[PDB]
Amino acid sequence: MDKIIVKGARAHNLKNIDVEIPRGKLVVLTGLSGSGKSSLAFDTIYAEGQRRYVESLSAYARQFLGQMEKPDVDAIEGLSPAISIDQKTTSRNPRSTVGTVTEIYDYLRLLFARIGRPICPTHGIEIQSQTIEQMVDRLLSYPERTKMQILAPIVSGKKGTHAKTLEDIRKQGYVRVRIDREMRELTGDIELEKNKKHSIDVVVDRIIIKDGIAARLADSLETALKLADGKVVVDVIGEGELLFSEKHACPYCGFSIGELEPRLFSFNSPFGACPDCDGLGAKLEVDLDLVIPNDELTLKEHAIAPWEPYYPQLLEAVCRHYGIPMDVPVKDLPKEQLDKILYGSGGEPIYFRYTNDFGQVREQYIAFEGVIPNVERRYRETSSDYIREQMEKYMAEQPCPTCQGYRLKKESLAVLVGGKHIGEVTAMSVTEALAFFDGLELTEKEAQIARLILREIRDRLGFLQNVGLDYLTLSRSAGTLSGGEAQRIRLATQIGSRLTGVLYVLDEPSIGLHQRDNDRLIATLKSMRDLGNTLIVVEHDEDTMLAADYLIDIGPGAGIHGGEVVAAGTPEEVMNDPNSLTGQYLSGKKFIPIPAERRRPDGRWLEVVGAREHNLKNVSVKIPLGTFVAVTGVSGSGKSTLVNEVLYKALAQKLHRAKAKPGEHRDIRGLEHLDKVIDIDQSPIGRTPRSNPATYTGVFDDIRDVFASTNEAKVRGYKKGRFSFNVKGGRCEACHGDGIIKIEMHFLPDVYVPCEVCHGKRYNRETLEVTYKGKNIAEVLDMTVEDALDFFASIPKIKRKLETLYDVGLGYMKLGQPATTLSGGEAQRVKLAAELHRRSNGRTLYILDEPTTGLHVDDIARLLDVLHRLVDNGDTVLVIEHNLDVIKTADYIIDLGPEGGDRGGQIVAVGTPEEVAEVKESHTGRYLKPILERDRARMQARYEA
Amino acid sequence: MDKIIVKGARAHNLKNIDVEIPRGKLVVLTGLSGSGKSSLAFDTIYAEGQRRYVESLSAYARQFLGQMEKPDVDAIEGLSPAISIDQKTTSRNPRSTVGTVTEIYDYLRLLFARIGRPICPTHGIEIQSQTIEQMVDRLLSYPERTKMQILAPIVSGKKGTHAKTLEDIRKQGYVRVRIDREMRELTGDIELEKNKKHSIDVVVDRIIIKDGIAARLADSLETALKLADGKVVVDVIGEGELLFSEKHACPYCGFSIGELEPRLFSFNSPFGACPDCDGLGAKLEVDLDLVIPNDELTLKEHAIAPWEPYYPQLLEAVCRHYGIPMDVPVKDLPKEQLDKILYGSGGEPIYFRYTNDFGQVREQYIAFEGVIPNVERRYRETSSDYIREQMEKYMAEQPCPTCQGYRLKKESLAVLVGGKHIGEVTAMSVTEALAFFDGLELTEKEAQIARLILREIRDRLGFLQNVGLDYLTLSRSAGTLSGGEAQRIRLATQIGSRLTGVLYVLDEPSIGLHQRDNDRLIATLKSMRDLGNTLIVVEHDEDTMLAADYLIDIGPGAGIHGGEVVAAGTPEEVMNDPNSLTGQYLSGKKFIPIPAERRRPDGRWLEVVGAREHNLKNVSVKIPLGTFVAVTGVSGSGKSTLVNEVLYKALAQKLHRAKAKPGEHRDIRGLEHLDKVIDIDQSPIGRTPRSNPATYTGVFDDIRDVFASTNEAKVRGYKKGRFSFNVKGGRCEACHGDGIIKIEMHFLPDVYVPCEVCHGKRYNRETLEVTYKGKNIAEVLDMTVEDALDFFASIPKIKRKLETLYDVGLGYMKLGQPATTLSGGEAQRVKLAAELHRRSNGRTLYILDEPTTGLHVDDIARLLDVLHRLVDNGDTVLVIEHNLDVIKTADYIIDLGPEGGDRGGQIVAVGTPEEVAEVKESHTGRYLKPILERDRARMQARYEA
Numbered sequence A, B: 001m002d003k004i005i006v007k008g009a010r011a012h013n014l015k016n017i018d019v020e021i022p023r024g025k026l027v028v029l030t031g032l033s034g035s036g037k038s039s040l041a042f043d044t045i046y047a048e049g050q051r052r053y054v055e056s057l058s059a060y061a062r063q064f065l066g067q068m069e070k071p072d073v074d075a076i077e078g079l080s081p082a083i084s085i086d087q088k089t090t091s092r093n094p095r096s097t098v099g100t101v102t103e104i105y106d107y108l109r110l111l112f113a114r115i116g117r118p119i120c121p122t123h124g125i126e127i128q129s130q131t132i133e134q135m136v137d138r139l140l141s142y143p144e145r146t147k148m149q150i151l152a153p154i155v156s157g158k159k160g161t162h163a164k165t166l167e168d169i170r171k172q173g174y175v176r177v178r179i180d181r182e183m184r185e186l187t188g189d190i191e192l193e194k195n196k197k198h199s200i201d202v203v204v205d206r207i208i209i210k211d212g213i214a215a216r217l218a219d220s221l222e223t224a225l226k227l228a229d230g231k232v233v234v235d236v237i238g239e240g241e242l243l244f245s246e247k248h249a250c251p252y253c254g255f256s257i258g259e260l261e262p263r264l265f266s267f268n269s270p271f272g273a274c275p276d277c278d279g280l281g282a283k284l285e286v287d288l289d290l291v292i293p294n295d296e297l298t299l300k301e302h303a304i305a306p307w308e309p310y311y312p313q314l315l316e317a318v319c320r321h322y323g324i325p326m327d328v329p330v331k332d333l334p335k336e337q338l339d340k341i342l343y344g345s346g347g348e349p350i351y352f353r354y355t356n357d358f359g360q361v362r363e364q365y366i367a368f369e370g371v372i373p374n375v376e377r378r379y380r381e382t383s384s385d386y387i388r389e390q391m392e393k394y395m396a397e398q399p400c401p402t403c404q405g406y407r408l409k410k411e412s413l414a415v416l417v418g419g420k421h422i423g424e425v426t427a428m429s430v431t432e433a434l435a436f437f438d439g440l441e442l443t444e445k446e447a448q449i450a451r452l453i454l455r456e457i458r459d460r461l462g463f464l465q466n467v468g469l470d471y472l473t474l475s476r477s478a479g480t481l482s483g484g485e486a487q488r489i490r491l492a493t494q495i496g497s498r499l500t501g502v503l504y505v506l507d508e509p510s511i512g513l514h515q516r517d518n519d520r521l522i523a524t525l526k527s528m529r530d531l532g533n534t535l536i537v538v539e540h541d542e543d544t545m546l547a548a549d550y551l552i553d554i555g556p557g558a559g560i561h562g563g564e565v566v567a568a569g570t571p572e573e574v575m576n577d578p579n580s581l582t583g584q585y586l587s588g589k590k591f592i593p594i595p596a597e598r599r600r601p602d603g604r605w606l607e608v609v610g611a612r613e614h615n616l617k618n619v620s621v622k623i624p625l626g627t628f629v630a631v632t633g634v635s636g637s638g639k640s641t642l643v644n645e646v647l648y649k650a651l652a653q654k655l656h657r658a659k660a661k662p663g664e665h666r667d668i669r670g671l672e673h674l675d676k677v678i679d680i681d682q683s684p685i686g687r688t689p690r691s692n693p694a695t696y697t698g699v700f701d702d703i704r705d706v707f708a709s710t711n712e713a714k715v716r717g718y719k720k721g722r723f724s725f726n727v728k729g730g731r732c733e734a735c736h737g738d739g740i741i742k743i744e745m746h747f748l749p750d751v752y753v754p755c756e757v758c759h760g761k762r763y764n765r766e767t768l769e770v771t772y773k774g775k776n777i778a779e780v781l782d783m784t785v786e787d788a789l790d791f792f793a794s795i796p797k798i799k800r801k802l803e804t805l806y807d808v809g810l811g812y813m814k815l816g817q818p819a820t821t822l823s824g825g826e827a828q829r830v831k832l833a834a835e836l837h838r839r840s841n842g843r844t845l846y847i848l849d850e851p852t853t854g855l856h857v858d859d860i861a862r863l864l865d866v867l868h869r870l871v872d873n874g875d876t877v878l879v880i881e882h883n884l885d886v887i888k889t890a891d892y893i894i895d896l897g898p899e900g901g902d903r904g905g906q907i908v909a910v911g912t913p914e915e916v917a918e919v920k921e922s923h924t925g926r927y928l929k930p931i932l933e934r935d936r937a938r939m940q941a942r943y944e945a
């Protein structure tokens, strides 16, 4: 009908709820973190929507799908085929690019196939293919009474008499030839000098342009072409020469390309893939920078990383031999001393005696190879996934020298459209490419053949621009993207589908998107909506909820406290509902208060100097320590690059001797102001179901100790291994301690189906016979963090760890919920739980990437309480954010790049939120200034009453 | 709505017709051969129906499909997603089986995966997998107060003292063991004899069956299992021993199978495929029968086929050496004389001098290898697709000795269900398998797990039975089937789909189906129809049209004469319509008259003796010559086997020295009564668009001679090669003379899209400038056979060839219609055109396989006129038919096998149609007798008036 109705859903924490959702309108689900938004939107509606359709694709599909586990719902009528847009269904697997995922690159292949003009690499001439028809036509183009001279280029500048020739075009009975530019009569006693080059062009027929001259031209052309192996010269009189050859081949060198097909431009096909790399575009060779961490480390104390505890004594051998000193800061070493040890003696024998691990001496007489060819050789020769991975650590990816990293054949790159070939177009940014196709100038036929293709390309690029991804390149690897970037890329791709009658389910599409470009997102969503489709968007953003048609608020609280439907109607009706916790924030009843004062920076500053990694413009910044710092700026400004790729990696290689190669920068000062830098990543916790909050926090380690110490375990001799999750002693031998069997879904994403032997309890029958206060290990692993700390108020050591998970924002999630099923924000927060409670010496720096992701404003409050508590104890908290409710709370903000892409990568404004708010050139402050003034008045309104 | 309407279709010969078709009812299209039945049903309705759906599967699909060539129709509303059932979409590609195509085999894999009991090959015991839970349970099954003796089988009959052992289970501190059946106390000074076997079973714990005995049992089991590497003996007191091991492994030999998955039983996966053949089930080695055509040919005149004009002189060398005589009928040769030459000297040096092709002599001293290892070696070593194919001619397929031809692993065959494994079940016939699953006896759990699978298997088998294919095996190769068998297999498979709202388009499903089983076909069609689907069936059969709801008769005549809708309504309304040519036959106004007398056989008989090839039962038959012979019988009776596999191949190897190995038979007499045997196959004419009626008949050869002799060609020097279809001289260089470019459809069947350079004219511009009576070669190649002979009444040699195509039944089809687009019957008929006009010496035998296929009864008349004209001139016409209108016309009929499968392959009745009609045991005569009496009265009714 005109609305989708769902009856009695109980996905996870849902309380047998009924809910109506308006068809074909922008519906927005909201609530606190873990109130059950995903349980309804994704685990219920989208699950049924996908299943019901895919289950009807065939019979085997219905047999395979109908036997598994269907969502926990009574009935849900008014459904439509469902398509989810989240981070869960975006490709992070190599060989894939932005061009491939957005489907744009395929359209590019099609374009190059249709109208692409293939050229000879050597000669740079558009190699053409004809039948005789198209040959005659062009010759007919010239006006009435036009003359020419058909020449069959029999010989083209070849040294040699050609006496074997001149007899035979004379044997046949020709008369008119052209030798070394001068034309001559046959039987004219012609002789050519042996060691001299000669250009012979036989003069077949010579015509006047008149009526019906076709058949004669024709015939003469066939003659001439049969003479010089399908090669003919059409020397015009008055103008210049014209040449034919037929088939995709060059008239001057043989080089051929046959036919223009799409797969000729694909790097997932041998029809297009480069030979010297097999369409990878990336080699894998030793980086000089990885071999030596710092350019100034004592060679006596293992300056070279790979050769580190035979080799240390080889070092001694070559050093002795060449006179290379041991006690050395590599930086001051002469270049040859380093060239010998790094690249080899080049055949010269080096004496080398060494004591084995046993103790016996064995002298040799080797021709030393070097440190780099050592790594390459040992990595290349071994067929072990262990040794390889041990040597790959000192290697990096370097663009294929043959294909220039374009992954395609040299003849595939020979085809160009607008003077640019496929790879060059791929290497542009979305802006650059959009501009390219705007300014691209074609012919009548070309544009008429490729109208439908060009419109699609332009539209897709424009979509990527709308979603705000107009900075990244089409050649950008898929795996190198962020979560938001990937989700939004899938969003644009999906916009390109133009589907109708589809129930889209988006999860927080404003993730990693500056507030400025919010309206655009909203604008495109509705467009999708206005294409006869229905959107169910799970958000927390204000404007996304204000521009919404309908608006459902889910569950007062999280976990067992939520799972209900608080308020539901227009964003004006939910706004005017006291029960809705969310409405209290939109109306302004409850809000996040601006600090009375901001922590003025002391004398401690980090100084990043000369940062020029990606789109950074020789940038130099000063980060204040002991304060809440927010690095803001539009997406594409390179916040990730500065904060993570440059700062964190340098600080890590310095403070913890990390091996990650830091981004291009001059130097970083104030390094003495702190001891440890913790980057609380947003990457998942574990990659197997073996990992969970309890495991990652270390709680599960202690939790086995209490079971091992209980009465029954003592008399059963179970220890802290029988209750161990990954230990054969007591775990379910069927699932091998996984608890959940992973089924193989071919085109659909893989599904976790509970182990039918342990029923998901993850342990065997006898292991769970051992009880602790009326509950076994499977039962306690199933407990909620809140219920857990309420259960373990007993042991202080368990308690102080669970308390971290509680303060963090969670406490609605279970101890044994597998890490593969955790939201990115949830994972980041479980890590925040690990770093939360530590004895702070006031000299450590935390780095959080968008810790807002997946949180309600009300949750942002508590989280900010936690972080500001970390700042209070002397530590420094750095945060990459777009969420204004956090930016305003910060004591110091560093705004990056005006606009994104190459238009940016430079500091727009630094200082306090107010100091940046009064910067007109900053979009951040342009959107922050009215929020500062809004909530500032809200407080004075409250304070006056 | 409730009916599908098509407006203004002009597919091929359609005359801009409008037609309404009733939804969800058995609609039947009929008419004369080439009236435009396929043009409407398949080239119009099904084309649009498939396209409209597949075009909506994605965006790239719509882009790829919408740019091609859509059917020539105005509009066609009320469409449904379309699925065609014909011979065009059945798999003839190797590795595929009946089980795979009907999807049944996959269900078999599923069944064997779910409930299959894997057994050890060596020991024949069901290898089991457990956790400790399932171990304890079975031990708990036995009543209260039951006793046992837990034994950890540490050593199992190993020769050796085990002094290293007995100290260590004593070092730990055990006491109770069991050695060589006798139990003993540790520290009892135990010594075992070195060269004697010893059986040591340590006696862990000994219990009474009581309450909560779990944990103790449990613990002791873990102890014992950890003792003997997860192996334990549970020796019961009163009964016998019970053994556990956990995981799919055998307690006595190690052998393992891990887990039961479907892909473990697939031969299209390395998880199931045999090692020594890679899941092919077929080797490929030299057949002794192919090396020597007859067992009695002069060795002087190349008795061995492969060694036939070096080798002839090698023959002389080995013959000299061993004393093997040259002038020899191989049959009388001693076995060793033949064993030496065939299998080799076995190392013994043979002198061998030979004269090169040059003339010089070169003596050698080789160790002769033989004639067979010669072939195997030369075939194996060469990597050329030419040499290989030259040696494969003397080779045959022989079942893989390792896997018994079951293509699966030895451990895959270890799994059995009803005492039979997967391959044995696959090797049964549909009847045998159906009976097997009827009589299969299972447990509660097994039957409960596999109910849905078993029902599907049973249903599919039953469907195959309904369509009449209950004789062939599930293991039968897909490529070895006939056209009707494959079409009908696809029909059954499609019945199994249970789809709804689908527009099925069948093409003559009664092909290769005896009249008896017609009602069944009709019965299932309706079932499909009664599943909310609409069937459009193109037929010619009476009963199929009588049982029809609606019934459309297309086009009065074929070609340009048809393409319209004559009559349309119920089969009672079309029956009572004078305009309908078909109705005149159903009503009985016009019919095929029974001969006044039948050609009594003279003294010439072919005598097939002792035929036992497939399901033939030592059969011996006498075929009368100089008469119209019809070999009839139910499908599965082995008509193909007798007529083609036995008779034709023997007659061919004798009369034309054909190399095809004839079926198993004793002898064939009367071979002196004829000179040539022509089998007019129903296989296609050509496999490329290069072949067509004009080419196959040889008309196109002469047709180039007239163009080569015309005025313009003389002055242009074009000859019988410039106008040649496959010659660069004048053909379209773009399509390379194909005229139609073949596009690549991945999951859909491949489509032919016209060459955009020659517009399908197949020649370049200048070649078609040469004219003959106002028409060029492209134009004349486009002409209809009728219009052609009307155009070439001129040249008698062209005329007498086109006339054959006319008399045949065609003459509505064009000269240049590519052979890949010809119906099987059409092809067979174009061959009938080739053999039609020849100077008959009265001593040749024709063999036609179901020449009725794709013909109206009215066409059957003319065709029978032709064939009986062939019989009139002295020749003999043999025909394999189910069509009663032909069988009744025959002068002599030979009915095969009562029922099909192994229930058959024996003569039911021979003689005149009336003599077989009075045979009660013949289904043929049981259905022929009332037709004989029907039309006999129709004639007397006409004769009396």
Ligand SMILES: [Zn+2]
Binding pocket: A120, A121, A122, A123, A124, A125, A250, A251, A252, A253
């Ligand atoms: Zn060139």
Ligand SMILES: [Zn+2]
Binding pocket: A274, A276, A277, A278, A279, A280, A281, A282, A400, A401, A402, A403, A404, A405, A406, A407, A408
């Ligand atoms: Zn490359």
Ligand SMILES: [Zn+2]
Binding pocket: A732, A733, A734, A735, A736, A737, A738, A739, A755, A757, A758, A762
């Ligand atoms: Zn398990």
Ligand SMILES: [Zn+2]
Binding pocket: B120, B121, B122, B123, B124, B125, B250, B251, B252, B253
């Ligand atoms: Zn065994």
Ligand SMILES: [Zn+2]
Binding pocket: B274, B276, B277, B278, B279, B280, B281, B282, B400, B401, B402, B403, B404, B405, B406, B407, B408
């Ligand atoms: Zn095999």
Ligand SMILES: [Zn+2]
Binding pocket: B732, B733, B734, B735, B736, B737, B738, B739, B755, B757, B758, B762
């Ligand atoms: Zn062509």
